[PDB]
């Protein structure tokens, strides 16, 4: 038969004896937010160079 | 008292009928006499499936209020 589920709102509590320190953050690539790109160019009349 | 007259009991529902006019403690051991004598009919020995069918077949729904189950 069916039984309805019931998920209570709970968290995971730890004692003070085991709280691990956080990992040391180091980076492996440069922080890039811009990249180059090859676009065509047009002259003053409207034609393509 | 009208379910006890379909079964055929016609003189046990006359003592409860004649006690309700007074509602007195001085005639109440007559009303506990009938409650004590009813257990001497006998045991209801049945098959195990036939006596555990209304117990093990229930209707569980999700239309309860979940706000009342968090406090419970």
PDB file of C-alpha atoms in Angstrom:
ATOM      1  CA  UNK A   1       0.000   0.000   0.000  1.00  0.00           C
ATOM      2  CA  UNK A   2       0.960   3.659  -0.170  1.00  0.00           C
ATOM      3  CA  UNK A   3       2.466   5.585   2.743  1.00  0.00           C
ATOM      4  CA  UNK A   4       2.788   9.391   2.504  1.00  0.00           C
ATOM      5  CA  UNK A   5       6.277  10.766   2.934  1.00  0.00           C
ATOM      6  CA  UNK A   6       7.201  13.315   5.592  1.00  0.00           C
ATOM      7  CA  UNK A   7      10.512  15.178   5.412  1.00  0.00           C
ATOM      8  CA  UNK A   8      11.100  17.226   8.581  1.00  0.00           C
ATOM      9  CA  UNK A   9      13.238  20.336   8.333  1.00  0.00           C
ATOM     10  CA  UNK A  10      16.492  19.319  10.020  1.00  0.00           C
ATOM     11  CA  UNK A  11      20.179  20.197   9.764  1.00  0.00           C
ATOM     12  CA  UNK A  12      23.445  18.499  10.735  1.00  0.00           C
ATOM     13  CA  UNK A  13      24.927  19.787  13.994  1.00  0.00           C
ATOM     14  CA  UNK A  14      28.533  19.176  14.995  1.00  0.00           C
ATOM     15  CA  UNK A  15      30.380  19.508  18.266  1.00  0.00           C
ATOM     16  CA  UNK A  16      33.242  21.938  18.696  1.00  0.00           C
ATOM     17  CA  UNK A  17      35.723  19.048  18.808  1.00  0.00           C
ATOM     18  CA  UNK A  18      35.351  18.338  15.064  1.00  0.00           C
ATOM     19  CA  UNK A  19      35.044  21.470  12.943  1.00  0.00           C
ATOM     20  CA  UNK A  20      37.657  21.136  10.230  1.00  0.00           C
ATOM     21  CA  UNK A  21      39.427  24.284   9.007  1.00  0.00           C
ATOM     22  CA  UNK A  22      38.640  25.346   5.472  1.00  0.00           C
ATOM     23  CA  UNK A  23      40.799  24.468   2.491  1.00  0.00           C
ATOM     24  CA  UNK A  24      43.469  26.934   1.402  1.00  0.00           C
ATOM     25  CA  UNK A  25      42.250  28.617  -1.776  1.00  0.00           C
ATOM     26  CA  UNK A  26      44.744  28.717  -4.642  1.00  0.00           C
ATOM     27  CA  UNK A  27      44.078  29.399  -8.312  1.00  0.00           C
ATOM     28  CA  UNK A  28      45.178  27.485 -11.403  1.00  0.00           C
ATOM     29  CA  UNK A  29      44.292  29.921 -14.205  1.00  0.00           C
ATOM     30  CA  UNK A  30      44.078  33.679 -14.598  1.00  0.00           C
ATOM     31  CA  UNK A  31      40.766  35.454 -14.053  1.00  0.00           C
ATOM     32  CA  UNK A  32      39.603  36.195 -17.598  1.00  0.00           C
ATOM     33  CA  UNK A  33      36.425  38.088 -18.458  1.00  0.00           C
ATOM     34  CA  UNK A  34      37.420  39.326 -21.933  1.00  0.00           C
ATOM     35  CA  UNK A  35      38.801  37.452 -24.946  1.00  0.00           C
ATOM     36  CA  UNK A  36      39.894  38.606 -28.409  1.00  0.00           C
ATOM     37  CA  UNK A  37      37.938  37.815 -31.552  1.00  0.00           C
ATOM     38  CA  UNK A  38      38.579  38.235 -35.275  1.00  0.00           C
ATOM     39  CA  UNK A  39      35.973  40.440 -36.967  1.00  0.00           C
ATOM     40  CA  UNK A  40      35.933  41.679 -40.578  1.00  0.00           C
ATOM     41  CA  UNK A  41      36.454  45.357 -41.298  1.00  0.00           C
ATOM     42  CA  UNK A  42      34.714  47.717 -43.723  1.00  0.00           C
ATOM     43  CA  UNK A  43      36.011  50.919 -45.278  1.00  0.00           C
ATOM     44  CA  UNK A  44      34.362  54.343 -45.436  1.00  0.00           C
ATOM     45  CA  UNK A  45      32.243  53.728 -48.544  1.00  0.00           C
ATOM     46  CA  UNK A  46      30.587  50.613 -47.133  1.00  0.00           C
ATOM     47  CA  UNK A  47      32.641  48.061 -49.034  1.00  0.00           C
ATOM     48  CA  UNK A  48      34.641  45.227 -47.486  1.00  0.00           C
ATOM     49  CA  UNK A  49      38.421  45.472 -47.213  1.00  0.00           C
TER      50      UNK A  49
ATOM     51  CA  UNK B   1     -31.125   1.096  22.638  1.00  0.00           C
ATOM     52  CA  UNK B   2     -32.661   0.526  19.203  1.00  0.00           C
ATOM     53  CA  UNK B   3     -29.664  -1.505  18.047  1.00  0.00           C
ATOM     54  CA  UNK B   4     -30.221  -3.781  21.050  1.00  0.00           C
ATOM     55  CA  UNK B   5     -33.817  -4.406  19.948  1.00  0.00           C
ATOM     56  CA  UNK B   6     -32.889  -5.501  16.431  1.00  0.00           C
ATOM     57  CA  UNK B   7     -30.725  -8.253  17.933  1.00  0.00           C
ATOM     58  CA  UNK B   8     -33.647  -9.557  20.007  1.00  0.00           C
ATOM     59  CA  UNK B   9     -32.772  -8.303  23.504  1.00  0.00           C
ATOM     60  CA  UNK B  10     -36.122  -7.112  24.858  1.00  0.00           C
ATOM     61  CA  UNK B  11     -35.599  -7.115  28.638  1.00  0.00           C
ATOM     62  CA  UNK B  12     -32.062  -5.710  28.974  1.00  0.00           C
ATOM     63  CA  UNK B  13     -33.178  -2.495  27.106  1.00  0.00           C
ATOM     64  CA  UNK B  14     -36.018  -2.227  29.632  1.00  0.00           C
ATOM     65  CA  UNK B  15     -33.692  -1.780  32.611  1.00  0.00           C
ATOM     66  CA  UNK B  16     -31.697   1.016  30.962  1.00  0.00           C
ATOM     67  CA  UNK B  17     -35.050   2.447  29.849  1.00  0.00           C
ATOM     68  CA  UNK B  18     -36.414   2.522  33.409  1.00  0.00           C
ATOM     69  CA  UNK B  19     -33.188   3.843  34.951  1.00  0.00           C
ATOM     70  CA  UNK B  20     -32.971   6.937  32.723  1.00  0.00           C
ATOM     71  CA  UNK B  21     -36.095   8.455  34.304  1.00  0.00           C
ATOM     72  CA  UNK B  22     -34.227   8.998  37.590  1.00  0.00           C
ATOM     73  CA  UNK B  23     -30.475   9.119  36.736  1.00  0.00           C
ATOM     74  CA  UNK B  24     -29.571   8.180  40.301  1.00  0.00           C
ATOM     75  CA  UNK B  25     -26.504   6.672  41.941  1.00  0.00           C
ATOM     76  CA  UNK B  26     -28.623   4.476  44.235  1.00  0.00           C
ATOM     77  CA  UNK B  27     -29.746   2.359  41.248  1.00  0.00           C
ATOM     78  CA  UNK B  28     -26.443   2.451  39.315  1.00  0.00           C
ATOM     79  CA  UNK B  29     -25.179  -1.045  40.377  1.00  0.00           C
ATOM     80  CA  UNK B  30     -27.991  -2.357  38.162  1.00  0.00           C
ATOM     81  CA  UNK B  31     -26.346  -0.562  35.224  1.00  0.00           C
ATOM     82  CA  UNK B  32     -22.927  -2.016  36.040  1.00  0.00           C
ATOM     83  CA  UNK B  33     -24.482  -5.457  36.473  1.00  0.00           C
ATOM     84  CA  UNK B  34     -25.442  -5.494  32.787  1.00  0.00           C
ATOM     85  CA  UNK B  35     -21.975  -4.297  31.761  1.00  0.00           C
ATOM     86  CA  UNK B  36     -20.295  -7.013  33.832  1.00  0.00           C
ATOM     87  CA  UNK B  37     -22.602  -9.832  32.689  1.00  0.00           C
ATOM     88  CA  UNK B  38     -21.965  -9.076  29.008  1.00  0.00           C
ATOM     89  CA  UNK B  39     -18.364 -10.322  29.110  1.00  0.00           C
ATOM     90  CA  UNK B  40     -19.451 -13.864  30.042  1.00  0.00           C
ATOM     91  CA  UNK B  41     -20.783 -14.568  26.546  1.00  0.00           C
ATOM     92  CA  UNK B  42     -17.432 -15.901  25.358  1.00  0.00           C
ATOM     93  CA  UNK B  43     -14.340 -15.163  23.288  1.00  0.00           C
ATOM     94  CA  UNK B  44     -14.393 -14.270  19.595  1.00  0.00           C
ATOM     95  CA  UNK B  45     -11.791 -16.644  18.180  1.00  0.00           C
ATOM     96  CA  UNK B  46     -11.425 -16.113  14.430  1.00  0.00           C
ATOM     97  CA  UNK B  47      -8.976 -16.734  11.633  1.00  0.00           C
ATOM     98  CA  UNK B  48      -5.898 -14.527  11.724  1.00  0.00           C
ATOM     99  CA  UNK B  49      -6.525 -12.927   8.328  1.00  0.00           C
ATOM    100  CA  UNK B  50     -10.211 -12.362   9.082  1.00  0.00           C
ATOM    101  CA  UNK B  51      -9.496 -10.518  12.351  1.00  0.00           C
ATOM    102  CA  UNK B  52      -6.537  -8.469  11.062  1.00  0.00           C
ATOM    103  CA  UNK B  53      -8.223  -7.138   7.914  1.00  0.00           C
ATOM    104  CA  UNK B  54      -9.914  -4.007   9.255  1.00  0.00           C
ATOM    105  CA  UNK B  55      -6.733  -3.213  11.204  1.00  0.00           C
ATOM    106  CA  UNK B  56      -4.188  -3.553   8.383  1.00  0.00           C
ATOM    107  CA  UNK B  57      -6.258  -1.871   5.632  1.00  0.00           C
ATOM    108  CA  UNK B  58      -6.306   1.898   6.144  1.00  0.00           C
ATOM    109  CA  UNK B  59      -6.592   4.966   3.916  1.00  0.00           C
ATOM    110  CA  UNK B  60      -3.525   7.203   4.143  1.00  0.00           C
ATOM    111  CA  UNK B  61      -3.928  10.569   2.424  1.00  0.00           C
ATOM    112  CA  UNK B  62      -1.829  13.658   1.762  1.00  0.00           C
ATOM    113  CA  UNK B  63      -4.771  16.029   2.365  1.00  0.00           C
ATOM    114  CA  UNK B  64      -3.833  16.519   6.026  1.00  0.00           C
ATOM    115  CA  UNK B  65      -2.511  19.892   7.160  1.00  0.00           C
ATOM    116  CA  UNK B  66       1.275  19.786   7.290  1.00  0.00           C
ATOM    117  CA  UNK B  67       1.366  22.778   9.649  1.00  0.00           C
ATOM    118  CA  UNK B  68       0.006  20.526  12.418  1.00  0.00           C
ATOM    119  CA  UNK B  69       2.546  17.729  11.871  1.00  0.00           C
ATOM    120  CA  UNK B  70       5.587  19.959  12.398  1.00  0.00           C
ATOM    121  CA  UNK B  71       4.498  20.728  15.962  1.00  0.00           C
ATOM    122  CA  UNK B  72       3.669  17.066  16.544  1.00  0.00           C
TER     123      UNK B  72
END
